[PDB]
Amino acid sequence: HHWGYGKHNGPEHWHKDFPIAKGERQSPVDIDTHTAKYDPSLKPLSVSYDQATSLRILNNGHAFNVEFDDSQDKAVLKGGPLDGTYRLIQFHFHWGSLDGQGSEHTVDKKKYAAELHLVHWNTKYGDFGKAVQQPDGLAVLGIFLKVGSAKPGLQKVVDVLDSIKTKGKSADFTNFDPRGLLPESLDYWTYPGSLTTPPLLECVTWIVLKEPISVSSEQVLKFRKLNFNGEGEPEELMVDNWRPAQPLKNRQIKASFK
Numbered sequence: 001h002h003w004g005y006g007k008h009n010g011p012e013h014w015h016k017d018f019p020i021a022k023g024e025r026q027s028p029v030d031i032d033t034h035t036a037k038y039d040p041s042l043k044p045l046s047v048s049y050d051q052a053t054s055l056r057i058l059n060n061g062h063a064f065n066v067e068f069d070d071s072q073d074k075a076v077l078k079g080g081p082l083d084g085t086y087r088l089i090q091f092h093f094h095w096g097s098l099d100g101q102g103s104e105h106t107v108d109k110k111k112y113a114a115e116l117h118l119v120h121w122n123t124k125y126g127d128f129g130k131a132v133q134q135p136d137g138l139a140v141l142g143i144f145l146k147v148g149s150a151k152p153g154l155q156k157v158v159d160v161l162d163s164i165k166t167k168g169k170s171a172d173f174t175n176f177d178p179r180g181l182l183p184e185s186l187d188y189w190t191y192p193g194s195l196t197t198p199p200l201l202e203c204v205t206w207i208v209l210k211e212p213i214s215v216s217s218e219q220v221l222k223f224r225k226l227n228f229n230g231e232g233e234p235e236e237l238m239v240d241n242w243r244p245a246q247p248l249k250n251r252q253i254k255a256s257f258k
């Protein structure tokens with residue numbers, strides 16, 4: 001009886017195995033746009049993905065992860081609210097059963113169809129496992145998805161999903177360029193938070209872009225054909241793999257833009 005997204009193992013149950021679920025800096029949150037304060041001290045975000053070497057894609061039973069070789073300083077996030085440099089290790093998405101839900105963060109209570117998370121670890125801690133034990137260990141770049149025009153840079157990901165339908169399936173996935181998943185603007189909100197899945201560690205500086213990307217209905221429909229279950233088990237479609245908004249508690253959300 002491991003954690004997941006169902007009636008009996010979903011987000012409202014997580015606190016029993018992971019009591020930090022009721023902690024002081026949990027994610028996601030609702031972004032109240034009128035309460036977020038413009039901070040003129042915030043720097044432009046620096047996203048340097050030109051040398052990102054994607055390696056593989058994996059169905060872990062919760063989402064699919066596109067993994068990167070993080071053994072050299074290649075794909076890095078810096079600037080913005082961050083001190084130092086953070087190395088890309090993987091990205092994944094959260095999405096809904098319907099276009100009206102799926103995002104983890106919300107904007108004035110609006111839910112987007114999906115949310116992309118590009119996960120980066122602080123190089124000062126040497127590896128990802130050590131970084132998640134630190135309050136400034138990770139920087140997650142969150143990008144909303146809305147349904148409209150196709151995102152051409154997403155299609156390579158969509159087209160490999162048939163080969164990783166079920167939990168524990170993986171495939172080679174080299175040469176994928178994550179720059180094709182970014183919106184035009186790097187305007188953002190930022191706040192201190194947590195992983196949004198168990199173990200829910202309070203190690204993340206969140207950077208949520210204001211501008212969503214558009215994906216087509218066909219693209220998101222292919223996400224929804226994935227399975228939570230393993231091969232040869234009863235089919236449970238991989239949908240609604242999002243944690244709802246958690247209490248803001250004693251936090252301020254800062255805006256990079258006026």
Ligand SMILES: [N]S(=O)(=O)[C][C][C][C][C]C1234B567B89%10B%11%12%13B85%14B%1158B%12%11%15B%139%12B%1061B%12%112C5%153B%14874
Pocket residue numbers: 117119129132140194195196197198199
């Ligand atoms: N949705 S999110 O971007 O907040 C984080 C996604 C998964 C975080 C990665 C880890 B899993 B396994 B161990 B557990 B703990 B260590 B290992 B993988 B990393 C972290 B957790």
Ligand code: NA
Pocket residue numbers: 030031032033107108109
């Ligand atoms: Na609100």
Ligand SMILES: [Zn+2]
Pocket residue numbers: 092093094117196
């Ligand atoms: Zn995530």
